[model samples]
Target: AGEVVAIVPAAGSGERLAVGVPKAFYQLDGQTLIERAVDGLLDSGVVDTVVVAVPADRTDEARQILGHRAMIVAGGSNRTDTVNLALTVLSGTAEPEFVLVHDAARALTPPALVARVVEALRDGYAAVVPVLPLSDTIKAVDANGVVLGTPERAGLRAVQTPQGFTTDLLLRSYQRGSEYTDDASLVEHIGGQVQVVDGDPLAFKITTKLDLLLAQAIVHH
Candidate 1:
């Protein structure tokens, strides 16, 4: 249990949302998504610092928006690259003992959820992520969309961030250089134990216009 730092990858353009700016710049209740995301970490009082990875061209804009609230860095083409860049930046500055990689798109994630992840790390889990039980049935399909097998919903969970991990373990996992959909998968690729904690319904990722509208409605209500 050492100093905990959070890294937010906010470089993605909201193509699905059809917004001209990056998804993190999208506003909800008058605040940008990235600002709300950073506030969750800071409000939790569990993280010592927050680092945000923004689009290379919008680094200055992000700095202006964040305004000393977090350290802003230029992000790479993909989420993995962005996270690795943030990790590199942290390594060069204040290397935390534990790191939480969060998504700026999950702007509604509660501070309690952030604390839960940190608590799991303090409990000695090398890596921890929040997960919600799947309500819909899941199925495996071939390239042609033919059903291969049906996976039990009871055994499946929708994973969410901020994913917590020991700093050294996460850095090594990233060094493996394998493409992964999530940070926990990177740890799993190296045979490290990735634990799951209960997740909040409010911590959903806002990817489309409908999602943004829903978030706005929820926040306002």
Candidate 2:
């Protein structure tokens, strides 16, 4: 409905990728992963300003990779902390009426998907997230990797972002100080309802070495 702001949390260490290089700096198509993600947000025409959160040690590199399109800021110990850090920055400014928090690893989030999330928020949703229905069997495993139970995949949805929220609601939720794996969790912690929109397969997180290669292949096509 008004100026939209976007926050991208890219501070993860990427130790699981096993590449030693920051995952955001990795190449997807001729472009760095972070660049692709930012491009999607920019193309969506939803953001008036974009904030990217980087690890403290790699701030310089992140700045270089993100170019001048996004403002780089130091992130915190956890994902929630990093997003909160960006939230702190947004709080100082004349905040936008709507804010979308995204992940730099989800480089393939198309402009259409971002627009859909924004639309949901404009429809009076306090919080909006995207999710893909489970396509395969999900099993709960113990620490030893033995399966505890097989969860029915019929109704489960794999969550992804471009999670949208009203700035007032998000700020209040953030102030509540309940750590969560995603923005939806934070809303839930505060007894706020989060609407789930349709998600695209391209919105998956690039966390593994093989995933990186697969992402490269997908983006090029």
Candidate 3:
């Protein structure tokens, strides 16, 4: 085995997508978003098992789509909670040495990018995640929506997934806190050094109706 297991958090309601439906169920390139997400992990060949966290009420539907390859568990109200729930479920079995957590909304994640992150972790890093240098200028803003200043993008990078970490390191972070925007951020809070790896251009998230339309157009051809 490649000593890695993947945990997918798919419980978010995706209100920003404004589809009046769960984002994971939305179609892109003739495939549901969740299917596209899972397909990458399945293709990795580095993962020993796959775990998907979904809303309790939506487990059946998720199960029907997920098939038998992935174990389905009830997710929590927020991203952090859902990830913790998946961790708890994983604890029932032998702990994986490496764990990767990915967002189901990023269905176009390239298999090569994921493998690269996993390779970095296996070599000796405590944590590894994909990052892309911000191509667009970023403007800092106040709460009132006034632009403070435009920040230089030369050294800044936008992080993406599948984020990889040692299993124990990840569990300890979850046990200590319930608030985090992403797994790497939580690890950072606990003093873990996170290494940024290169990410894929195609691995963008679908968070709006227009994004879905665009993703469909991009992936179908």
Best by lDDT: 1
lDDT for 191 (candidate 2): 89
The TM-score of predicted model 2 comes to: 0.90
Per-residue C-alpha lDDT of model 1 across residues 74-164, encoded as one tens digit per residue: 9888889999999887674667889999999999999999999999999999999999988788999999999999987888899999999
Candidate 3: Cα lDDT at 97: 89
Backbone clash numbers for all candidates listed: 0, 0, 0
Where does model 3 exceed 4 Å of error?
144-150
TM-score of each: 0.96, 0.90, 0.93
lDDT of 3 by residue, 136-217 (tens): 7899999999999977778688988899999999989888873477899889888989998899977777788787777777
What's the TM for model 3? 0.93
- Candidates 1 and 3 compared: the better one by TM-score is 1
Name every residue pair that clashes in candidate 1: none
Scored against the true structure, residue 144 in model 3 reaches a CA lDDT of 100
Q: Once all C-alphas are superposed, what RMSD does model 3 give against the true structure?
A: 1.8
CA RMSD for every model? 1.4, 2.1, 1.8
User: Regarding lDDT, does 1 or 3 come out ahead?
Assistant: 1
Model 2 agreement with the true structure over 1-221: per-residue lDDT tens digits: 48788999988877898766777777666887778889999998877889998889978887777678999899898889999899987775587798899998898888999999988987888899999988778999999999999877876778999899999889998889543778878778888898999999888888888888878787565
